Design a protein around this nucleic acid. Structure first.
Lengths: 44, 100, 50, 150, 553
RNA sequence: GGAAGUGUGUUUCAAAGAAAAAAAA
């Protein structure tokens, strides 16, 4: 919830890029685990 | 167990840029042993990970177009001879390694 | 290219240099380094281990 | 009011189209692999258009002008004359077998009419070049003509 | 003749297993006895195929297709009837497999398409079905099955290059590591061939496969067949590898040097061409025991035969060490470098290799081509060698002579004439493809710049739908520049060209105008239409005098 | 040297041209 403070705008640029990449990876991982759960339920 | 680089980073766009996050250590060193232990423990905890940890939020416009123009002008003034770019390789200069 | 507008009789010194280079670096070898230049080496020196 | 050059019409030797044009060693005016350029020289009183085969060392094939299209005296200054010359060039190009041409000119005045006639009559244009050949030495290296009306 | 076809058990109408077995035995004996399809044997094949709407089995259809592929049965009616009678069986198998999931159909269709490609006949329906199967199930197939399907699709002449390239890109993305780590020479060569045949851009994968093949060659576990195939595929890819071709040239030179060393002395070894001829004679004897140039044509059309490389079975690994001197030509070594930052070739194979070198341009920017060209000239001018050659090998030799016009020390006019006669025999007997034929004719015209021709002209007249405007116009120019002056033979094609106005490029119109200006033939409508086509094609290019071409397209 | 092409280091034309308009084929 609380994010750091930097001395240059380069740092915020890269921080935002990293945030976006992490969120996309989170969406992919959540979808993969949902598919995992669906497959497990179908198998059982 | 193919890694992310083994799986997806062989594509053109995906394979173009590939940052390094950890130092590479040759097999047979304390750093390598600790990295192996961390990887094993992290994989096991990924197995025993909950759902809340993979929550993601919808993507939205980070900046308005006018704000993007202002940011571009300020970055250009900061580096008037070079072109503005996210130099993620030079990242360590701007963001401390501990807060990457 | 036209024979009356091109340059002929010149040495292919660059091709000779490439052919001799093949000796030190095999032609069937990597084209770049693990760290690709000044920026990559800066990243290597500025990334911590575990 | 024949709509053509009176003297060429009168002296036409049996009227074989392109009878007086020198031909290649193969007996053809145009090779199937030749490109064509229309050079237009415009002025207040007349427009001279020359179609040239680029492959044959930029050799003139045929040309047209106000007299050739049948326009005399003051009528040569209007846009109708320029459009008529353009139409004549396009029609003769179609007859010969020329479809695509490259346009070249020095003065841009009275060239829009020729271009419009080409487009209307189907003479496609692949490129346009304005070659004014402006002085690169001075303005009075050779004293130009006196200004009219003192 | 005609006794075998009269006596074979062909007269039995029914769906009985006895009928099927008798048909299978009849086709087995047909394979054993019947000669290759050619000018000499036409009526025999026509009647046999017409007699063979009809009820067939999977095995019987596969045998029929294989027999047609082996014997070069290019008659359209035969394939039309075969596919008409095969459609029911394939549809039934498709429905059976669909219902089971909700032999094998893909395997059978792929084999039929392979036979059609071998005979150069196009099966649009089968190719489209294979394309749909590839687009639908590519991830399902394992690496070898996917490689085989991609190779077949690429070999097909109508498959879209963009789609094939996209499928190849997906295949590479899926299986780049396993193949690049451990792939046998045959699989790697097939991968390279399928990439080249459709111009797929896979630079890194191509380089890695080339590195592994070069490691094989350095270790000496590669046959002359495989080396020639590598040279051909690199020529197709425009892969201008320097050390590899230098290594091949050095191998040829050292082979010739040892040949001369032992020929000077009392004891010498038999020639590679002699061994090949002996093996061909042995195979002819084997065929006769089991039962003009039929005995050679069957050998060339055997299933394991490749046009420019002979029969794959004769050639074996060159040897662990072949070059005494350090060779001009591994993953661990690549990693180390990145971290550290510091048994004999044939005459036709040599001709093909030097043709590849000429295409890549080594003859100009190289120092190891002149001696090998002299060696090839010496080995080719000899009598007898030219007679036993493939159409593609003859084309390679003709290209070699035409390109090294001046470099030739002697004038092998007799050798060129004998090669031309051999190739013309192949062309009239239908073993020569139009691609191999236009190159040969153009090469001969180039060499000459600075009956047999009637047979060539008649073959061209009868086979007009086999090739594209490229080949048609290029041969029309080549014949005229050889000297034909046949108003009929030239005015025949005027209407054909008018009809196929659209498919003519700048090269095509150039060839046509050259031909019809050398032949002294007038066709105002032809010339006018061709001129309009040329104008339209060049409308998307602008250039200025003394400044070259500025903008293209 | 002009104009082009790509199995090439290839081909073609070539040391001034131009002598109604509008059409048919």
């Amino acid at each position: 919830d609380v994010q750091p403070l930097f001395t240059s705008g380069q740092a915020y640029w890269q921080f935002e890029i990293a945030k976006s990449q992490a969120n996309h990876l989170l969406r992919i991982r959540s979808v993969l685990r949902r598919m995992k759960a669906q497959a497990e339920a179908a198998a059982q | 167990s193919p890694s992310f680089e083994q799986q997806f980073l062989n594509d053109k766009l995906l394979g173009q840029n590939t940052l390094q996050f950890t130092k590479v250590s040759e097999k047979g060193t304390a750093d390598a042993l600790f990295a192996e232990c961390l990887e094993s423990i992290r994989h096991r905890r990924f197995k025993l990970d909950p759902d809340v940890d993979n929550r993601s939020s919808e993507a939205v416009e980070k900046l308005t177009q006018e704000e993007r123009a202002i940011a571009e002008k300020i970055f250009q003034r900061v580096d008037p001879e070079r072109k503005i770019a996210p130099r993620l390789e030079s990242r360590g200069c701007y963001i401390d390694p501990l807060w990457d | 290219k036209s024979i009356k507008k091109k340059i002929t009789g010149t040495d292919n010194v660059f091709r000779h240099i490439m052919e001799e280079s093949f000796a030190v670096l095999p032609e069937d070898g990597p084209e770049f380094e693990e760290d690709g230049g000044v920026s990559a080496k800066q990243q290597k020196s500025q990334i911590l281990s575990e | 009011t024949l709509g053509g050059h009176p003297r060429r019409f009168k002296l036409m030797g049996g009227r074989p189209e392109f009878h007086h044009v020198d031909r290649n060693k193969n007996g053809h005016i145009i090779e199937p692999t030749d490109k064509f350029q229309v050079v237009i020289t415009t002025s207040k009183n007349n427009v001279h258009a020359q179609v040239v085969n680029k492959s044959r060392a930029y050799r003139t094939i045929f040309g047209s002008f106000a007299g050739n299209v049948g326009i005399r005296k003051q009528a040569q200054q209007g846009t109708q004359c320029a459009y008529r010359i353009g139409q004549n060039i396009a029609r003769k190009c179609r007859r010969l077998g020329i479809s695509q041409v490259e346009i070249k000119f020095r003065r841009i005045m009275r060239v829009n009419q020729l271009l419009q006639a080409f487009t209307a009559h189907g003479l496609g244009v692949t490129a346009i070049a304005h070659e004014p050949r402006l002085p690169k030495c001075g303005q009075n290296a050779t004293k130009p003509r006196k200004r009219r009306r003192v | 003749p005609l006794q075998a076809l009269a006596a074979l058990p062909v007269w039995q109408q029914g769906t009985s297993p006895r009928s099927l077995e008798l048909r299978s035995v009849s086709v087995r004996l047909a394979h054993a006895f019947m000669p290759p399809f050619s000018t000499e044997t036409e009526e025999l094949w026509c009647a046999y195929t017409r007699r063979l709407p009809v009820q067939l089995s999977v095995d019987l259809g596969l045998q029929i297709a294989r027999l047609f592929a082996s014997r070069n049965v290019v008659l359209a009616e035969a394939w039309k009837g075969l596919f008409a009678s095969m459609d029911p069986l394939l549809r039934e198998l498709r429905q059976r497999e669909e219902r089971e999931s909700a032999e094998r159909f893909p395997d059978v269709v792929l084999k039929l398409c392979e036979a059609a490609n071998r005979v150069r006949h196009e099966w649009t329906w089968g190719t489209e079905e294979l394309m749909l199967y590839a687009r639908r199930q590519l991830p399902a197939l394992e690496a070898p099955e996917a490689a085989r399907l991609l190779h077949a699709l690429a070999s097909s002449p109508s498959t879209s290059e963009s789609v094939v390239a996209r499928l190849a890109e997906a295949f590479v993305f899926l299986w780049e590591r396993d193949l690049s780590g451990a792939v046998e020479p045959a699989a790697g060569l097939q991968l390279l061939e399928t990439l080249a045949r459709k111009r797929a851009t896979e630079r890194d994968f191509i380089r890695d496969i080339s590195r592994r093949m070069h490691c094989y060659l350095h270790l000496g576990l590669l046959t002359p067949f495989e080396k020639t195939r590598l040279a051909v595929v690199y020529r197709q890819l425009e892969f201008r590898h320097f050390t590899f071709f230098r290594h091949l040239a050095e191998e040829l030179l050292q082979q010739n040097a040892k040949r001369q060393r032992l020929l000077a002395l009392g004891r010498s070894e038999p020639s590679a061409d002699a061994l090949q001829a002996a093996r061909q004679h042995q195979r002819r004897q084997r065929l006769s025991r089991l039962q003009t140039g039929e005995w050679r044509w069957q050998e060339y059309l055997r299933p394991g035969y490749v046009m420019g490389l002979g029969l794959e079975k004769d050639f074996s690994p060159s040897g662990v060490i072949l070059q005494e001197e350090i060779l001009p030509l591994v993953a661990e070594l690549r990693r180390g470098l990145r971290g550290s930052l510091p048994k004999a070739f044939t005459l036709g194979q040599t001709a093909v290799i030097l043709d590849s070198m000429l295409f890549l341009g080594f003859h100009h920017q190289s120092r190891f081509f002149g001696p090998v060209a002299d060696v090839l000239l010496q080995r080719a001018t000899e009598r007898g060698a030219v007679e036993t050659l493939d159409p593609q090998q003859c084309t390679s030799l003709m290209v070699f002579f035409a390109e090294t016009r001046r470099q030739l020390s002697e004038d092998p006019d007799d050798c060129i004439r004998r090669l031309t006669e051999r190739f013309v025999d192949a062309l009239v007997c239908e073993v020569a493809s139009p691609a191999q034929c236009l190159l040969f004719f153009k090469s001969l015209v180039k060499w000459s710049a600075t009956p047999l021709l009637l047979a060539v002209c008649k073959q061209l007249c009868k086979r007009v739908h086999n090739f594209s405007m490229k080949e048609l116009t290029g041969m029309l120019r080549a014949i005229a520049y050889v000297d034909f002056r046949e108003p009929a033979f030239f005015t025949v094609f005027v209407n054909y060209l008018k009809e196929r106005l659209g498919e003519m490029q700048e090269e095509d119109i150039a060839n046509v105008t050259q031909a019809f200006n050398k032949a002294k033939i007038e066709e105002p409508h032809l010339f006018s239409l061709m001129g309009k086509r040329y104008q339209h094609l060049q409308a998307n290019v602008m250039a200025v005098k003394r400044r070259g071409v500025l903008v293209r397209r």
